[PDB]
Design a protein around this nucleic acid. Sequence first.
DNA 1: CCCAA
DNA 2: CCCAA
DNA 3: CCCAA
Lengths: 494, 494, 494
Amino acid sequence: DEKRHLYEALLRHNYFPNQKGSISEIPPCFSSRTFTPEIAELISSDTSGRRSLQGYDCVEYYATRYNNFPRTLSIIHPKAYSKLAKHIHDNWEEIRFIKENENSMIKPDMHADGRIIIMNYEDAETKTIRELNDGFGRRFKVNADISGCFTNIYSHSIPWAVIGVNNAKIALKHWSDKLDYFQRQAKRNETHGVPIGPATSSIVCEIILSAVDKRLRDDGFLFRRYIDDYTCYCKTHDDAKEFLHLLGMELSKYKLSLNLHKTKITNLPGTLNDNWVSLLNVNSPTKKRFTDQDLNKLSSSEVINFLDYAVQLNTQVGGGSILKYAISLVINNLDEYTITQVYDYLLNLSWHYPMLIPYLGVLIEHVYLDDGDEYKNKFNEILSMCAENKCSDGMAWTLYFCIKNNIDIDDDVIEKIICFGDCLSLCLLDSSDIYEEKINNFVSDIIKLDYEYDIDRYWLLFYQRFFKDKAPSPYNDKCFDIMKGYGVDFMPDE
Amino acid sequence: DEKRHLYEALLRHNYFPNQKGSISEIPPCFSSRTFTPEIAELISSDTSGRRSLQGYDCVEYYATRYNNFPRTLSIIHPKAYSKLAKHIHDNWEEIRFIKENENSMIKPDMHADGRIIIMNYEDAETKTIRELNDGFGRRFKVNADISGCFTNIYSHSIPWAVIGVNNAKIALKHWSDKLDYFQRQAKRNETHGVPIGPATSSIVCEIILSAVDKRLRDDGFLFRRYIDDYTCYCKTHDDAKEFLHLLGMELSKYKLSLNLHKTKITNLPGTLNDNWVSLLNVNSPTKKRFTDQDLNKLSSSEVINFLDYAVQLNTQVGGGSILKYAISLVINNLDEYTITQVYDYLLNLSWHYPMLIPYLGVLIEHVYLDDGDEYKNKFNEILSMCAENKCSDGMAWTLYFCIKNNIDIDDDVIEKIICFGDCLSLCLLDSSDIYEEKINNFVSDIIKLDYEYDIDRYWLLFYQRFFKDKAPSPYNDKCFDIMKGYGVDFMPDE
Amino acid sequence: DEKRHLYEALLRHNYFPNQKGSISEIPPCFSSRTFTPEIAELISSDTSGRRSLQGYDCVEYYATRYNNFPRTLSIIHPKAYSKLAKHIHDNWEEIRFIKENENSMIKPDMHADGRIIIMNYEDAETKTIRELNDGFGRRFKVNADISGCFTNIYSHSIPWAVIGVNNAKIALKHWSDKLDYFQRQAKRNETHGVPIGPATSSIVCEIILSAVDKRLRDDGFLFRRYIDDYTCYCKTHDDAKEFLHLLGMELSKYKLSLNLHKTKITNLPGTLNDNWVSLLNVNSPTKKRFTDQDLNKLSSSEVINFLDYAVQLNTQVGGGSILKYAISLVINNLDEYTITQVYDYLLNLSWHYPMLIPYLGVLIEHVYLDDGDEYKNKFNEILSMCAENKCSDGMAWTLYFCIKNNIDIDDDVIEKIICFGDCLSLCLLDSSDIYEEKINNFVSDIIKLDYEYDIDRYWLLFYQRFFKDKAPSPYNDKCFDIMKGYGVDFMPDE
DNA sequence: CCCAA
DNA sequence: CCCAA
DNA sequence: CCCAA
């Protein structure tokens, strides 16, 4: 069923930020499964407890981009998220028009693994044919980015996209207003912004932007929207300017604005991908298959020189995730002679760029990690860099590697982890049970601060300690008790 | 025999512009065969008919270059061309000194297919050895282009190249003066310019430039001439300047001038080809043979990324036919999975660059052209672009593909084809017999205009309608009747 | 034994400049073998003879770099070199601390072929792991070159590096002062500069720079020294500036200075090699092994286009020996169809860049050198270029090829060789015995000039003529008689 | 692997 | 195929 | 080999 798959996607698969295709932003030890729709129904049915503050804060997870710029993913508190997901499920007949939006490529869709939101799920076949069909006969390409699609989207504009702005103003119940209310409750009862990473906020953004897509489609524009990025194909240059103008009016109707720095008009034919993508693939040592596995095994010189050229392209161009693309090109065609060289190169690049840290888990088995403790020092230096740069993705993945592979962590970097206080990193540290007293001191400071949003920012740590009977429930409601009684575990075993 | 091969080359093979090596400028449905030297002798023997105007105009065929710049190829009227080819044949003993010109690479030569003029016929072996032998010991390379070798060459300078300028001035019969007269009669009795594409004008240009080559050779210069482009290899820089000066005086002796924008002096060692050629071949996915056909079959990612890199190189460098070179690199190593992707990419690039249109005939069989009529819309949009940009090569090749592969053509683009009025495109439209009344209206307008040059500009259309008994002969001479009686057909069946 | 291997390395293997890894700076017909430590002991024991001048001059050998910049290698006179090598051997216990210097990569080391100094002997395994371990956790790379490590190194600073500057000043016997004296006697009793190429001067430079390396190491700096080039890896930018400052003080302590033009600070991660190295290897047609020899045989188009791209990279970047790297990439994977093309390309590039001349010996057998005498003209034009540009490496290698392969040399270029008067080229000319009277006139001019340094600059030519009984010994000592009596030959047969 | 320092 | 939006 | 002049 579409409805049941939507419910299980919202809670069991796309609650945590898990929208990436190949490697996740979060280590795989964190999983939102065993959090079923029945449990969320029981949470939403709970009315006990008193909150001094209005709304709920969320666990914040800082993941670096390719330019080391932090992006704040969020894990919503399960009470507010359960209510929001239940309301989205209950009115899915009125919401599912976002599925039949041909212009939006990244939208809800029934996937095999159980998700609804997967970025870049479509294959290169249909992708290539689609951009060649859209770009045919047109000599201008328009790239326009919404400035604040996650950070300043208007929750009160959720009705305005559904029934119209004027009709929603006269009408002030409808499901869109309740969706607005629950989306506000997801983040501290704040009217602006949505948590990045869950599919509920992606559904809300699709609902808001579907009216803009419909208005642009009714004017005859050929365009594709990936989340907030619009790519339009225009026969003439005034058509590009008119698309930009009409998109500006349609975004300003819902209190949104184009990123004036990011919008650009290029001459077709450009490239189907970015230019660095073709530069990398045309220089890839693994670009041709041989159908025998011994032939397509890369040597040391090939991979080392290709990664050096990738660093050259990242410095010179820097138009995207060049290093991650090249590493994913060469990481699966390695032989056992060259594992140490590529692994040390990945260690250096991962110290410089934390987004390359998860690739260390690809070759984490072949590398003799005991050795002469040099790898322990390198991993702890990576942890120091992650604590200094305040990035949660690299620290979480490195801590996952150290816990799984029994790499020892010094006390000095544990002090830096507590000073940073990333919720997922502290969840991993609590799951190791070595550092119980420091986690206890941290959560005691959070409790004695008596701020409800401070507890909400570490609800996952508090629930992981409560579920293992290491700490009482910080809240006075029954949501944590309901989740513990039905065996909800966000750090499950295999 | 050299003489008979020359005659049959001039009339049966190199009458139409057919000097290209791999793919012709004209679709293969047009052929100058079945136009034998005996028929041209009979045409030249004909003296009947009266012309109000002096000379003959020619069919004009606008072929795009790599930068979309139009180049006007010309098909000479068969009366003037027959007289010109007969005069060139009859005095071939006095003309054939252009064969023994070592500096001119593109010159008449007895070829297997029957032509005398084929551009770049020589193999990479002798080419590579020749530019390495010429460039050895020299540190300067001079590239100097004649500005108007086709557009402002002096017909009265045809005697001046043969017997000398002063001796030809005192002499004012000689065969060079009659060659001048027939070359003038080839284009409207105009003293300046030669029709591009036939080998008669190439022979005339070789005759004129052979004296310049002899004067440069007698001074000890090591140089190579490709049509109008001079490439000289010099030990010192003053030798380069002295070559430029002496070439300027030798060209000004025959009322020619160097293209001052195009001339340049580069430092040896450069590259044997252009720099983009080596950039393409060093990045080519097909650059290495494997001797088994399954191994050297390119995947989708390889060809798509190589063509994206080719578009990048065409935008960034633009020093030559980059896209045509890369397409010819990858078009013969395609598997049946990737035919649709590469064909759609070629359709887009061919809409943007009409010179890539003939490559659509390489994969015209494997593509399911019926489908859902999308390919029909794409071909008609290409026809619209060709009508708007006023290019005859792309329109002629697209019309050939549509007629051969039964792609339907709307009336709206037929209006644009009649508005453009390309002679070869209208020949194809008349050969389809669907659009008889519109072609009849067009030729009725040409007849009622009563301009002899206007009839000469569409002589091929008029003769194709006369040969199929769809229209009477527009002329009053017996040339068309002679060609019809001996079964001359410029649109023959296989 | 380490001591005996050091002695035989200093005299039999690393007397001549033979520090290169793959191809030597000197043709292999020159060999310093059959010059044993016993013979050098006998030379140093000799006290006969009188010298008007103090010290000895050395044979000068001008080898081009990648930018055609001459570098003066030197072959020390065997009396001064024998004394210097004997003194270095006799106190090797006090000198061998330069072996245990971890920061210096190019240092004395017991090698299989008998040398102690081989540049870049270490494999890519340990090299790659070492630069990845050193560059981990650091974001700045410092490249600082000593300006005059060969040309203005202070011989009187040899004690200052050993016992300290102040202690050596108070002390004014010690072995360092005698090493200073013998190093001065090696080059004309001059206090500044060392002869480039022998391992004795490399040992002296290592002795001087070992104190600087120790002072930089005791401050906690992570750095690597290749001859005169320092590469330091720093966590912060002030650490880079502090390394530069401390290295400046440590060099100024021994009257050395940094090359202020060459020093630079780059951002890690850069590339393990230079950027052009990865650009060449990522574009190399031979970069992947196939384990069957027929598959990894390069075609003509592959090598020709790769060498054209290499010339493009050498012109555009010019950061190192790009052409030599690419030629060594493609010279060992050639098939017999493409030998002529690559050989002519190498002939052109070797005329333009004499450092590529030794590669002509790789394919000197497969090329039909008799032919139509064109290769003779090309080799003599290369000899003319070498005489004009005053380069000894290209002339010596070309003369070796002409003598070995019986390529005739005209008298006109022999005049240019005598006018240049390179000692090794004249040694080869004397070893051919064709040009005996011209070599006799040259050495008669040197003798009648009555300058002892002029005889010392051609001591190798004088000894080669004396050993073959073609001329008497120019000196009045017994060193040449000792070398002749024990069969020392610097041009030995196989 | 293949250069140079 | 392999990124990101 | 594969373009253009």
